[PDB]
Amino acid sequence: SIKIRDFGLGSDLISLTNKAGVTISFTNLGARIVDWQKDGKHLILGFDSAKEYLEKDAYPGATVGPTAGRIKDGLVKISGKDYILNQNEGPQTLHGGEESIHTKLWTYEVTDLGAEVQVKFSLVSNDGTNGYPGKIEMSVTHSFDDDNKWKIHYEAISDKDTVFNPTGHVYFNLNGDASESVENHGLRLAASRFVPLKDQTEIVRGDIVDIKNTDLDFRQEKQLSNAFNSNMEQVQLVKGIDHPFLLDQLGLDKEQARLTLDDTSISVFTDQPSIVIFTANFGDLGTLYHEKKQVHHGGITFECQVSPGSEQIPELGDISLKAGEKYQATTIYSLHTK
Amino acid sequence: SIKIRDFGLGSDLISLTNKAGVTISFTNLGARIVDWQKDGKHLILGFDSAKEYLEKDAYPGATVGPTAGRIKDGLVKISGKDYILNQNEGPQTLHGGEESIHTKLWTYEVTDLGAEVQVKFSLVSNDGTNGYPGKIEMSVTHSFDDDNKWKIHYEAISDKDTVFNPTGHVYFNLNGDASESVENHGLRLAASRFVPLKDQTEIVRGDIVDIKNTDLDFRQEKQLSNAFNSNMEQVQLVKGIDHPFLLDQLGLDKEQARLTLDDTSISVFTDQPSIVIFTANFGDLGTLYHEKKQVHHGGITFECQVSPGSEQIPELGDISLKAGEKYQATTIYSLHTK
Numbered sequence A, B: 001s002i003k004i005r006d007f008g009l010g011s012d013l014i015s016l017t018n019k020a021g022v023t024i025s026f027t028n029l030g031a032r033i034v035d036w037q038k039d040g041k042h043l044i045l046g047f048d049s050a051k052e053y054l055e056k057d058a059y060p061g062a063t064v065g066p067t068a069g070r071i072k073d074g075l076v077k078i079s080g081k082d083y084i085l086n087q088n089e090g091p092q093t094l095h096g097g098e099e100s101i102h103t104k105l106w107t108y109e110v111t112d113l114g115a116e117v118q119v120k121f122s123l124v125s126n127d128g129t130n131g132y133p134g135k136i137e138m139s140v141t142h143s144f145d146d147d148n149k150w151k152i153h154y155e156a157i158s159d160k161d162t163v164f165n166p167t168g169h170v171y172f173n174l175n176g177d178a179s180e181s182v183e184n185h186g187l188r189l190a191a192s193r194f195v196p197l198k199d200q201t202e203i204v205r206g207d208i209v210d211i212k213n214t215d216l217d218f219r220q221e222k223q224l225s226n227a228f229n230s231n232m233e234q235v236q237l238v239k240g241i242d243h244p245f246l247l248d249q250l251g252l253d254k255e256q257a258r259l260t261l262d263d264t265s266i267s268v269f270t271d272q273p274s275i276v277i278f279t280a281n282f283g284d285l286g287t288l289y290h291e292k293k294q295v296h297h298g299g300i301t302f303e304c305q306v307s308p309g310s311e312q313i314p315e316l317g318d319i320s321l322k323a324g325e326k327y328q329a330t331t332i333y334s335l336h337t338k
Helices: A050-055 A224-228 A231-236 B050-055 B224-229 B234-237
Strands: A002-008 A012-016 A023-027 A032-036 A075-078 A081-084 A105-114 A115-127 A136-145 A150-156 A188-189 A192-193 A242-247 A257-261 A264-268 A274-280 A301-304 A327-336 B004-007 B010-018 B023-027 B032-038 B075-078 B079-085 B105-113 B118-123 B136-145 B149-158 B185-191 B191-194 B241-248 B258-263 B264-270 B274-278 B301-307 B327-336
Touching: A002 A050, A002 A115, A012 A105, A012 A115, A136 B185, A231 A242, A301 A327, B004 B050, B010 B105, B010 B118, B301 B327
Parallel strands: none
Antiparallel strands: A002 A012, A012 A023, A023 A032, A075 A081, A105 A115, A115 A136, A136 A150, A150 A327, A188 A257, A192 A242, A242 A274, A257 A264, A264 A327, A274 A301, B004 B010, B010 B023, B023 B032, B075 B079, B105 B118, B118 B136, B136 B149, B149 B327, B185 B258, B191 B241, B241 B274, B258 B264, B264 B327, B274 B301
């Protein structure tokens, strides 16, 4: 089944249900996933209306870009020349700048393939938007298959050499209760390195660090508590997890991380070289999600992209987007209940 | 009565019916007007889906900007410096540049006042969009009365010094059929002067002209065919009308233009100083509207704004907008059937 409903402020809500009866929903407001249930269970963090996103937190579950993460001083060197993008967080560019693509209503088309439904969102990023050279014709496809697979496929073309490194901003919470800490979940990640943050400013510092000893080792499945009730100076800094993890094996084939709670689990797969893991260190913010105040560590992301920092640590990779070249990315969230 | 419907590609169709049974409809795509009927007959041009607009012609009935008209060489001078805007038509900047505001899905909130139904459309022009310094926060309100009054109230505020001068691109066709030329309409226009174009380039010349002794003289009501038939240099140039006409008296109180066909007539009020008139000189192009091939002279617009060309003819006014100041503009289309 497929059901289209009005989400508010002119936005649509596209909800898909598979043969397993698993539901899922997206909105054209920021090309996001609004919810994902399983037995009246929310496996993610979400609001009930567009207004909620615009008033409480516009990032949750959205497609964020053109550049995801922070960019020191909003500076970027394109084909030599220095460009300054919109400074969102102090002098930094946080997820594309002010009022970026997560706040825009994307047009969309749905394609019912039977065992899979795809909702293709499109939006054009004008030449110069937020300092970004262009224009960048972007599209984000959100599909749900009959065998519990949540897939995101990115595509982009630009008239001008530019930068492009978007990501999906979902937060998970198997407790289905925002007032419940993601503390109890087990995490597995095929990351042995990590990118430390210099300050509270949260920019990168320049290091790459062998996470081998350190509690930030989820190679072996281990509870979230280990990292939460921990003392690295890094965890203390961010008051949880607000770091970019680098993966050992590259390729869409591989499970790169696993989020599990009891019988229900969520597996990760990307095309990308990194997964930024943010564990909602909001403290007493307490954003309401379904009339339920979120708690510190109320959820966790798995933002798959090219690590933020590239600008300072080229070893990270190259976020540029050649004019005319077709950008592509694929990330997958596969839910299991074995 | 108020009715909302999906219009296609993620867009909505908002239809307002008055006590008189007159219906009007708008879209968030381009904050535009899709239709306006009385007695089962259209008074304007428009399509039946969002795709038609993006496919055949995205201008009709749309909100156009940030700057309505053509800017020679895309050049505008702001606060001392010179800026180059998106070059959309040759070296020109036509209607805000490529993939502008008329191409976007705006958000909206409906206000029902009974005898009046307001539909407020919102959109943020990001700093740097199509070369426009910014952020520009805009809202365009479309309302419809029990006394058949359609009004467009515009609003805007920028973070930086910029330029702003949008318009409403509606096309009327009192025949209710694109295949029937508007030649048969009566026009009355309170304008003594007009700004001539210099070439098929349609850029401005630098000249203001006294239209007394010309077929372009509409002070005293006359049939449209009088102008179409003219052998006036300009008329011949454009193959009809495609000029800004400078209104003599200014003020929202005055009827500046009246377009009539039989018992039906549209009166035009605005706070702006000029009216750009374009009689769809589409030759054999034959754009299909409602399955009807539009004829050359198959429509006529009334684009209320500051006359285009001020850049080369400062006499025309000043299009700038200073950071912080509130831009506002009001234009009204009123239906009488007397």
